[PDB]
Design a protein around this motif. Structure first.
Motif, PDB file in Angstrom:
ATOM      1  N   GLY A   1      28.620  34.352  37.001  1.00 59.98           N
ATOM      2  CA  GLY A   1      27.846  34.369  38.233  1.00 59.98           C
ATOM      3  C   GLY A   1      28.413  35.231  39.344  1.00 59.98           C
ATOM      4  N   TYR A   2      29.395  36.090  39.062  1.00 56.70           N
ATOM      5  CA  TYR A   2      29.988  36.936  40.093  1.00 56.70           C
ATOM      6  C   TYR A   2      29.189  38.226  40.256  1.00 56.70           C
ATOM      7  CZ  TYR A   2      34.106  33.999  40.319  1.00 56.70           C
ATOM      8  OH  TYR A   2      34.947  32.940  40.517  1.00 56.70           O
ATOM      9  N   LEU A   3      29.144  38.703  41.491  1.00 60.24           N
ATOM     10  CA  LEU A   3      28.648  40.028  41.807  1.00 60.24           C
ATOM     11  C   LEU A   3      29.838  40.988  41.700  1.00 60.24           C
ATOM     12  CD1 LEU A   3      26.390  41.848  43.116  1.00 60.24           C
ATOM     13  CD2 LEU A   3      27.478  41.343  45.325  1.00 60.24           C
ATOM     14  N   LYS A   4      29.612  42.134  41.063  1.00 63.86           N
ATOM     15  CA  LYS A   4      30.647  43.140  40.874  1.00 63.86           C
ATOM     16  C   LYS A   4      30.665  44.054  42.099  1.00 63.86           C
ATOM     17  CE  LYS A   4      32.053  46.595  37.381  1.00 63.86           C
ATOM     18  NZ  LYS A   4      33.444  46.133  37.355  1.00 63.86           N
ATOM     19  N   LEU A   5      31.795  44.118  42.814  1.00 67.64           N
ATOM     20  CA  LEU A   5      31.889  45.001  43.975  1.00 67.64           C
ATOM     21  C   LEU A   5      32.457  46.360  43.605  1.00 67.64           C
ATOM     22  CD1 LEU A   5      33.230  42.571  46.708  1.00 67.64           C
ATOM     23  CD2 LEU A   5      30.906  43.427  46.445  1.00 67.64           C
ATOM     24  N   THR A   6      33.465  46.375  42.738  1.00 67.85           N
ATOM     25  CA  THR A   6      34.125  47.597  42.304  1.00 67.85           C
ATOM     26  C   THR A   6      34.510  47.457  40.836  1.00 67.85           C
ATOM     27  OG1 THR A   6      36.350  46.897  42.840  1.00 67.85           O
ATOM     28  CG2 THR A   6      35.087  47.922  44.641  1.00 67.85           C
TER      29      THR A   6
ATOM     30  N   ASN B   1      37.209  46.577  39.682  1.00 66.50           N
ATOM     31  CA  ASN B   1      38.120  45.459  39.436  1.00 66.50           C
ATOM     32  C   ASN B   1      37.932  44.246  40.338  1.00 66.50           C
ATOM     33  OD1 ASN B   1      39.403  47.346  41.409  1.00 66.50           O
ATOM     34  ND2 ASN B   1      40.940  45.705  41.491  1.00 66.50           N
ATOM     35  N   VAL B   2      37.032  44.289  41.317  1.00 69.77           N
ATOM     36  CA  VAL B   2      36.842  43.199  42.270  1.00 69.77           C
ATOM     37  C   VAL B   2      35.440  42.621  42.115  1.00 69.77           C
ATOM     38  CG1 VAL B   2      36.831  42.476  44.688  1.00 69.77           C
ATOM     39  CG2 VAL B   2      38.479  44.248  43.926  1.00 69.77           C
ATOM     40  N   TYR B   3      35.388  41.293  41.997  1.00 68.92           N
ATOM     41  CA  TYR B   3      34.180  40.505  41.813  1.00 68.92           C
ATOM     42  C   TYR B   3      34.143  39.419  42.881  1.00 68.92           C
ATOM     43  CZ  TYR B   3      33.977  42.774  37.257  1.00 68.92           C
ATOM     44  OH  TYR B   3      33.900  43.707  36.245  1.00 68.92           O
ATOM     45  N   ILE B   4      32.944  38.956  43.254  1.00 68.13           N
ATOM     46  CA  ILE B   4      32.803  37.980  44.336  1.00 68.13           C
ATOM     47  C   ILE B   4      31.687  36.983  44.014  1.00 68.13           C
ATOM     48  CG2 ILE B   4      31.263  39.435  45.744  1.00 68.13           C
ATOM     49  CD1 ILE B   4      32.960  38.491  48.152  1.00 68.13           C
ATOM     50  N   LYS B   5      31.863  35.748  44.485  1.00 68.51           N
ATOM     51  CA  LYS B   5      30.908  34.677  44.251  1.00 68.51           C
ATOM     52  C   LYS B   5      30.964  33.698  45.420  1.00 68.51           C
ATOM     53  CE  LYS B   5      29.981  31.154  40.646  1.00 68.51           C
ATOM     54  NZ  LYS B   5      30.549  30.591  39.387  1.00 68.51           N
ATOM     55  N   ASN B   6      29.808  33.132  45.767  1.00 69.18           N
ATOM     56  CA  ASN B   6      29.753  31.997  46.684  1.00 69.18           C
ATOM     57  C   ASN B   6      30.118  30.766  45.873  1.00 69.18           C
ATOM     58  OD1 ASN B   6      27.117  30.005  48.156  1.00 69.18           O
ATOM     59  ND2 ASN B   6      29.234  30.227  48.842  1.00 69.18           N
ATOM     60  N   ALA B   7      31.336  30.264  46.057  1.00 65.23           N
ATOM     61  CA  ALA B   7      31.793  29.139  45.256  1.00 65.23           C
ATOM     62  C   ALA B   7      32.932  28.442  45.977  1.00 65.23           C
ATOM     63  CB  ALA B   7      32.237  29.583  43.854  1.00 65.23           C
ATOM     64  N   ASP B   8      33.090  27.158  45.648  1.00 68.47           N
ATOM     65  CA  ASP B   8      34.240  26.362  46.050  1.00 68.47           C
ATOM     66  C   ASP B   8      35.362  26.653  45.061  1.00 68.47           C
ATOM     67  OD1 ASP B   8      36.107  24.347  46.516  1.00 68.47           O
ATOM     68  OD2 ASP B   8      34.596  22.787  46.789  1.00 68.47           O
ATOM     69  N   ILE B   9      36.459  27.245  45.546  1.00 63.49           N
ATOM     70  CA  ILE B   9      37.540  27.668  44.659  1.00 63.49           C
ATOM     71  C   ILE B   9      38.101  26.494  43.866  1.00 63.49           C
ATOM     72  CG2 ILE B   9      39.369  27.507  46.410  1.00 63.49           C
ATOM     73  CD1 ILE B   9      40.601  30.046  45.193  1.00 63.49           C
TER      74      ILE B   9
ATOM     75  N   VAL C   1      40.318  40.778  40.073  1.00 65.04           N
ATOM     76  CA  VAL C   1      40.300  39.671  41.015  1.00 65.04           C
ATOM     77  C   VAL C   1      38.879  39.153  41.177  1.00 65.04           C
ATOM     78  CG1 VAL C   1      40.407  41.240  43.040  1.00 65.04           C
ATOM     79  CG2 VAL C   1      40.986  38.823  43.271  1.00 65.04           C
ATOM     80  N   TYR C   2      38.755  37.833  41.037  1.00 62.51           N
ATOM     81  CA  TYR C   2      37.523  37.074  41.179  1.00 62.51           C
ATOM     82  C   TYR C   2      37.639  36.291  42.479  1.00 62.51           C
ATOM     83  CZ  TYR C   2      36.395  38.698  36.616  1.00 62.51           C
ATOM     84  OH  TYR C   2      36.090  39.525  35.552  1.00 62.51           O
ATOM     85  N   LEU C   3      36.904  36.714  43.494  1.00 61.20           N
ATOM     86  CA  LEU C   3      36.976  36.117  44.819  1.00 61.20           C
ATOM     87  C   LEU C   3      35.932  35.023  44.981  1.00 61.20           C
ATOM     88  CD1 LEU C   3      37.251  39.417  46.845  1.00 61.20           C
ATOM     89  CD2 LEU C   3      39.093  37.752  46.541  1.00 61.20           C
ATOM     90  N   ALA C   4      36.382  33.857  45.422  1.00 65.87           N
ATOM     91  CA  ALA C   4      35.521  32.719  45.710  1.00 65.87           C
ATOM     92  C   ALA C   4      35.412  32.578  47.222  1.00 65.87           C
ATOM     93  CB  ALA C   4      36.093  31.442  45.093  1.00 65.87           C
ATOM     94  N   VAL C   5      34.183  32.608  47.723  1.00 61.38           N
ATOM     95  CA  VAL C   5      33.899  32.480  49.145  1.00 61.38           C
ATOM     96  C   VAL C   5      33.109  31.197  49.337  1.00 61.38           C
ATOM     97  CG1 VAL C   5      32.783  33.475  51.137  1.00 61.38           C
ATOM     98  CG2 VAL C   5      33.942  34.963  49.492  1.00 61.38           C
ATOM     99  N   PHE C   6      33.704  30.232  50.043  1.00 61.50           N
ATOM    100  CA  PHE C   6      33.109  28.902  50.178  1.00 61.50           C
ATOM    101  C   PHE C   6      31.801  28.936  50.958  1.00 61.50           C
ATOM    102  CE2 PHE C   6      33.127  24.717  52.532  1.00 61.50           C
ATOM    103  CZ  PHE C   6      32.712  23.976  51.443  1.00 61.50           C
TER     104      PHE C   6
END
Ligand SMILES: O=C(O)[C@@H]1C[C@H]2CC[C@@H]1CN(c1ncnc3nc[nH]c13)C2
Length: 167
Positions: free
Chosen positions: A6-11, A13-21, A149-154
């Motif tokens: 469910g991550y969006l690919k930014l670059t 090597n960097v991925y991002i998701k709205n999630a509770d880490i 890196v898989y970034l979780a943004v609450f």
């Protein structure tokens, strides 16, 4: 191929998701979860308080022994400890805390710690209660971290703003 979903690919090597880490760590069991630590490893609030609570305070007990032996971390530094029930390892990384007057340039040094690990689940360093601009934190992350890196943004509102403003 890895288990992050469910991550969006930014670059590359960097991925991002709205999630509770915490919930993401519980489901993925990543090799490395990053904690938004302070130099004393006092996990009172923010991401650190949430991660520690999810370990039933075992993270804090381990951390107190680490500090008693080694003394405080440096701002911009890190240590590897157990991931307890959340991950194999926890990389405790100290970003600068703007609400303490620390130099934001240290944010790049903080993210450099991620390069020692091939894959990580992480929050945005110095965001939240650490007082930095999360958009800036994301930019430094992308321009510093070369590993995956898989970034979780609450916060959903913040997640949408980070995506929509990403260059
Ligand atoms: O990611 C966010 O929404 C903001 C950016 C950082 C500081 C302030 C908030 C929350 N903070 C977090 N706090 C607790 N659990 C989290 N899981 C992911 N991030 C978490 C991270």
């Amino acid at each position: 191929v890895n288990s992050f979903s469910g991550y969006l690919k930014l670059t590359d090597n960097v991925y991002i998701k709205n999630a509770d880490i915490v919930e993401e760590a519980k489901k993925v069991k990543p090799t490395v979860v990053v904690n938004a630590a302070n130099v004393y490893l006092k996990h009172g609030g923010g991401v650190a308080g949430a991660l520690n609570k999810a370990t039933n305070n075992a993270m804090q007990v381990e951390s107190d022994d680490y500090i008693a032996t080694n003394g405080p971390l440096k701002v911009g530094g890190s240590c590897v400890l157990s991931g307890h029930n959340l991950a194999k390892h926890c990389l405790h990384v100290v970003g600068p805390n703007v609400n303490k007057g620390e130099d934001i340039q240290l944010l790049k040094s903080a993210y450099e710690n991620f390069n020692q690990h091939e894959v990580l689940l992480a929050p945005l360093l110095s965001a939240g209660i650490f007082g930095a601009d999360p958009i800036h934190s994301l930019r430094v992350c992308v321009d510093t971290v070369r590993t995956n890196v898989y970034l979780a943004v609450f916060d959903k509102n913040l997640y949408d703003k980070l995506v929509s403003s990403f260059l």
